[PDB]
Amino acid sequence: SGFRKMAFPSGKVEGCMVQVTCGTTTLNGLWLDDVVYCPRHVICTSEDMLNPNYEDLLIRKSNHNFLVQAGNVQLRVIGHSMQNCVLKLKVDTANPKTPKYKFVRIQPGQTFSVLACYNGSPSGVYQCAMRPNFTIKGSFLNGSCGSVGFNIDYDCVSFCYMHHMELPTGVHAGTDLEGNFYGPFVDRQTAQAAGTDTTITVNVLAWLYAAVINGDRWFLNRFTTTLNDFNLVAMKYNYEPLTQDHVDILGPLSAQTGIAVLDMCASLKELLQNGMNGRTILGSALLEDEFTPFDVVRQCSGVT
Amino acid sequence: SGFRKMAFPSGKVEGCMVQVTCGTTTLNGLWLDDVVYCPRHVICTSEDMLNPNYEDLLIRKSNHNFLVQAGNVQLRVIGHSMQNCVLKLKVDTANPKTPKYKFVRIQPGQTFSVLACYNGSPSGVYQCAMRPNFTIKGSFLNGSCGSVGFNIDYDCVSFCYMHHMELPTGVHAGTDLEGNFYGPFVDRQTAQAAGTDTTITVNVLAWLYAAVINGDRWFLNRFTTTLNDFNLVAMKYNYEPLTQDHVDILGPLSAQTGIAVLDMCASLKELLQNGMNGRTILGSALLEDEFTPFDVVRQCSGVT
Ligand SMILES: N#CCOc1ccccc1C(=O)NCc1cnsc1
Numbered sequence: 001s002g003f004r005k006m007a008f009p010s011g012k013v014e015g016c017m018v019q020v021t022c023g024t025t026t027l028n029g030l031w032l033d034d035v036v037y038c039p040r041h042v043i044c045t046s047e048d049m050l051n052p053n054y055e056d057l058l059i060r061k062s063n064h065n066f067l068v069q070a071g072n073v074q075l076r077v078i079g080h081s082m083q084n085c086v087l088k089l090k091v092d093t094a095n096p097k098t099p100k101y102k103f104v105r106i107q108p109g110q111t112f113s114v115l116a117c118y119n120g121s122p123s124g125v126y127q128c129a130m131r132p133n134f135t136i137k138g139s140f141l142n143g144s145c146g147s148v149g150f151n152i153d154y155d156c157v158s159f160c161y162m163h164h165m166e167l168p169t170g171v172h173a174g175t176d177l178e179g180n181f182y183g184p185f186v187d188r189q190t191a192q193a194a195g196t197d198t199t200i201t202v203n204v205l206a207w208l209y210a211a212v213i214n215g216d217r218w219f220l221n222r223f224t225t226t227l228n229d230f231n232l233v234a235m236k237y238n239y240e241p242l243t244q245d246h247v248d249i250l251g252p253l254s255a256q257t258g259i260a261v262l263d264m265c266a267s268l269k270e271l272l273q274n275g276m277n278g279r280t281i282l283g284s285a286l287l288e289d290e291f292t293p294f295d296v297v298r299q300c301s302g303v304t
Numbered sequence: 305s306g307f308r309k310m311a312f313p314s315g316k317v318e319g320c321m322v323q324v325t326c327g328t329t330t331l332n333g334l335w336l337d338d339v340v341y342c343p344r345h346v347i348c349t350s351e352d353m354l355n356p357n358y359e360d361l362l363i364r365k366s367n368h369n370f371l372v373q374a375g376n377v378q379l380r381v382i383g384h385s386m387q388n389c390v391l392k393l394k395v396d397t398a399n400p401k402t403p404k405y406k407f408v409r410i411q412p413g414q415t416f417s418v419l420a421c422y423n424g425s426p427s428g429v430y431q432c433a434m435r436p437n438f439t440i441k442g443s444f445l446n447g448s449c450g451s452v453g454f455n456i457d458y459d460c461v462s463f464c465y466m467h468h469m470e471l472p473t474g475v476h477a478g479t480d481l482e483g484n485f486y487g488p489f490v491d492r493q494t495a496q497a498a499g500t501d502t503t504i505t506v507n508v509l510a511w512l513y514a515a516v517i518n519g520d521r522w523f524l525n526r527f528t529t530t531l532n533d534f535n536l537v538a539m540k541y542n543y544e545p546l547t548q549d550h551v552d553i554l555g556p557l558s559a560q561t562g563i564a565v566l567d568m569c570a571s572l573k574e575l576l577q578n579g580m581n582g583r584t585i586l587g588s589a590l591l592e593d594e595f596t597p598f599d600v601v602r603q604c605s606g607v608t
């Protein structure tokens with residue numbers, strides 16, 4: 001019993017964190033096999049950040065200009081390339097701590113763990129979610145660029161995110177491990193406002209099932225609704241539209257608790273229309289949306 | 305920018321997790337040097353849990369009865385002892401992944417990271433706090449016993465907690481690494497109700513400073529208070545009394561933000577007397593108390 005914002009064990013990802021220096025800029029890199037992956041803005045100076053031409057800037061850089069340090073030992077750069085907004089630094093040594101891995105581009109609503117690093121060293125681990133506006137509400141300071149988001153399936157690490165920047169509103173933007181940004185963000189110091197931060201409806205439902213399982217049942221009501229009715233209510237409150245796909249994904253939670261998905265929707269509907277009235281659900285005074293139906297099933301079953 | 309419930313990187317602790325089996329019971333163990341530490345209720349059967357005499361139960365167990373498995377390889381038990389509520393299994397091999405470590409008994413209000421394990425394998429990491437009633441609001445299922453709480457200071461892991469049980473109210477009880485329970489809990493299936501779960505006042509103040517630093521300032525008011533006045537308000541709301549020691553601990557946060565500790569207390573006082581009025585602080589609708597003044601300083605400065 002008990003429900004917590006749980007991150008994956010970070011050991012496998014710690015073994016990949018390196019420090020990348022180019023000129024005076026120092027950020028983090030991800031070392032998998034003989035390749036070190038890092039944000040391309042490592043090649044920029046504070047004067048370049050406003051409007052950089054990365055192709056032009058990269059002409060001035062050679063293999064010896066990128067200083068890669070794994071722990072306290074220097075890695076030899078035998079090649080470099082730019083793929084979208086990341087740099088791939090071919091080193092002469094394969095990372096001996098390289099776990100089994102995949103590079104996946106996740107959808108908004110999916111959650112992942114972030115290993116926050118500074119100067120190639122891990123400082124903390126926390127759980128995140130790709131917001132519907134393609135931002136992440138991380139906790140990142142200057143020098144955190146290069147830190148990665150990830151999911152683990154027993155022994156395989158699926159890298160999904162790499163941190164690149166903080167928007168003027170304090171939220172975060174980054175790429176997948178192919179260098180493609182999530183959303184419309186560009187790696188330059190320009191006007192980039194985020195879109196509507198809507199609530200992940202399927203994740204709030206999953207978190208309501210996690211509360212029923214753990215004993216919090218005060219919010220269960222005598223009502224039901226239809227998908228269309230609930231969606232009219234969800235539109236008003238800036239909640240993502242719930243689809244039949246989301247209902248099917250909530251299937252094993254509905255099955256375990258014996259509460260039909262549309263019944264839980266009518267509970268969510270009343271909570272939106274009436275508030276919590278000073279009460280709490282899983283020790284939280286607001287409707288949590290950063291646990292997927294999969295995270296609930298994993299945490300509640302004990303998947304290792 | 306951004307403030308998250310951040311856990312320490314778990315790699316160093318993952319390298320210590322082993323599986324301990326005694327008869328039909330299987331729980332987790334912590335392998336440091338040539339010693340495997342685990343809860344003593346590993347020697348109990350479901351029939352013993354009601355009223356066990358661990359000294360008597362232990363007479364029937366020999367070195368070969370405790371099956372220690374580090375990863376997929378078996379560890380040889382060359383000795384066993386009981387220290388309070390833990391068992392120390394002397395193995396023939398020192399753990400080659402033993403980090404620098406200390407065993408510390410923490411006070412209530414202190415926070416730590418938990419590495420939740422099942423069958424010796426880590427499944428998740430989250431941040432906890434020793435509640436003022438000596439319980440922890442963890443996320444633990446059957447077989448999670450043996451999972452440990454910890455803090456890291458650069459390279460040294462301070463082990464502070466080992467999970468032992470779940471009280472009938474769904475909260476958790478456990479020991480320090482010497483086997484001494486936090487609070488009055490006993491490792492038996494008996495009536496054990498928790499005391500008042502008061503709010504950690506110094507941690508709410510620290511979290512209010514973390515919000516000011518990160519841009520959330522709506523709650524800052526034109527008022528101030530005295531320690532005695534604030535404490536009368538804190539008594540009413542089941543908040544821990546604030547001491548001059550807590551004021552001094554909040555010194556660097558007060559210094560960085562330029563907001564006197566007693567001014568932040570009057571902000572906390574108004575928030576307690578008037579509620580949040582549907583607003584949020586650091587994306588939370590309730591006053592967070594599981595970040596110490598040290599955690600705020602660490603997260604906001606980027607200590608690796
Ligand atoms: N605002 C802002 C940028 O500062 C940061 C704050 C938090 C996390 C990362 C950075 C960071 O180091 N970005 C560097 C950068 C990215 N694209 S052009 C320069």
Ligand SMILES: N#CCOc1ccccc1C(=O)NCc1cnsc1
Nearest residue numbers: 353444445446447468469470491492
């Ligand atoms: N209620 C209850 C116990 O079940 C648990 C739930 C969550 C975490 C641990 C346990 C657990 O395995 N305790 C075993 C135990 C501890 N002392 S006598 C038997």
